[PDB]
């Protein structure tokens, strides 16, 4: 039932792959739709206007020409309501950029290697999650500049962590990576709630060696994207399917899952083609009514999540679509590519 028209496109002049794109879902109703792109040592902001206009706002160029941004995530200052943008990549440095001025406010060193994804907690705008090439996830409090917790170690991931997602209420995180596993880390445990409270009073970081659930029985290759769909999980590898699944047996409550739970239940698969290369994200809109994924030859797939597929193509769009982003009202869908191109699709 969802139809789109390609109204505009452009190419960034660095000609390098764009790995991340995010609309600012914190902008208030009646304010312009803004999105950020990341790739090379660049972070660029654009504003969407009528008749498909993509207005370049400003660009951040890292002083380090060898930096390669892989991810970005929006938040806001909990005291001034000012928008904020976190970016990170190959250098493993988290930069908090003021998006109004495109200047870096501060940066965090910590991860032993590249940062593959950043996510902000859905209730607390100060809680930033980073997933890294060093096999760990890190939770930061960007108000007090503290490392709350490191999720890794004895039973942590055994290879690069590629993706992670908080659930809708921010009680838990599901991570995934190169070791083919998906691991659950509850952050509403008395231990984690207290560590978060202590980060505000500041530092001794929590070292969480053991996840609340783990499986290697969904995919048989690198797991490069994970998102919660209510109590269910959507995850993909390079096997031309997004798998919808849940820990435990069919009737098992996600909050009653024990850490040693050996079962998983597959609920369905979203099948597609030509997306068998590593490092390709899927995305959902705010209301989780639409699911989008680009493929390695520039096709954009869109599914209606309220029923269980629309294919968006343009003859000039033939490069791998690394990530997509819906505007908060789902009226606009942006796709970014391996050839530095950006595509704007408007919902009909």
């Amino acid at each position: 039932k969802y139809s789109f028209k390609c109204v505009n496109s452009l190419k960034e002049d660095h000609n390098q792959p764009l790995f991340g794109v995010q609309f600012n879902w914190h902008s208030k109703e009646g304010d312009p739709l803004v999105f950020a792109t990341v790739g090379s040592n660049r972070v660029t902001l654009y504003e969407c206007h009528s008749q498909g206009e993509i207005r370049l706002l400003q660009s951040y160029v890292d002083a380090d020409a060898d930096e390669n941004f892989y991810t970005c995530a929006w938040t806001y200052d909990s005291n001034t309501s000012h928008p904020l943008l976190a970016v990170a990549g190959s250098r493993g440095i988290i930069r908090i950029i003021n998006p109004i001025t495109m200047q870096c406010i501060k940066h965090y060193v910590g991860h032993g290697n590249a940062i593959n994804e950043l996510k902000f907690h859905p209730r607390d705008p100060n809680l930033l999650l980073s997933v890294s090439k060093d096999h760990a996830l890190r939770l930061w409090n960007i108000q007090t500049d503290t490392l709350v917790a490191i999720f890794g170690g004895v039973e942590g991931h055994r290879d690069e962590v590629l993706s992670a997602d908080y659930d809708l209420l921010g009680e838990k995180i599901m991570s995934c990576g190169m070791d083919h596993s998906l691991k659950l880390w509850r952050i509403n445990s008395k231990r984690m709630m207290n560590a978060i409270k202590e980060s505000y009073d500041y530092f001794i970081s929590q070292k969480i060696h053991f996840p609340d659930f783990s499986t290697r029985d969904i995919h048989r290759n690198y797991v490069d994207c994970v998102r919660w769909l209510g109590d269910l999980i959507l995850s993909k590898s390079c096997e031309n399917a997004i798998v919808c699944w849940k820990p435990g047996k069919m009737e098992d409550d996600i909050d009653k899952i024990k850490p040693s739970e050996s079962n998983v239940t597959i609920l369905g698969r979203f099948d597609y083609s030509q997306c068998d290369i590593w490092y390709m994200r899927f995305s959902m809109d705010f209301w989780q009514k639409m699911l989008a994924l680009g493929n390695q030859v520039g096709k954009l797939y869109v599914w209606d999540l309220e029923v269980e597929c629309t294919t968006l193509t343009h003859h000039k769009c033939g490069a791998a679509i690394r990530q997509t982003s819906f505007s908060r009202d789902s009226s606009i869908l942006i796709a970014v590519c391996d050839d530095a191109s950006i595509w704007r699709w408007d919902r009909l």
């Binding site: 902008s27 208030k28 312009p32 806001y76 928008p83 109004i100 809708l168 209420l169 209510g230």
Partner: peptide, 26 residues
């Protein structure tokens, strides 16, 4: 589905929290 009801109620809580906020435009 029951899962869709959880998505509706939980996204509604986040939407109400967003409606209470007035973040400065970029």
């Amino acid at each position: 589905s029951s899962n869709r009801q959880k998505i509706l109620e939980r996204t509604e809580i986040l939407n109400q929290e967003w409606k209470q906020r007035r973040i400065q435009p970029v």
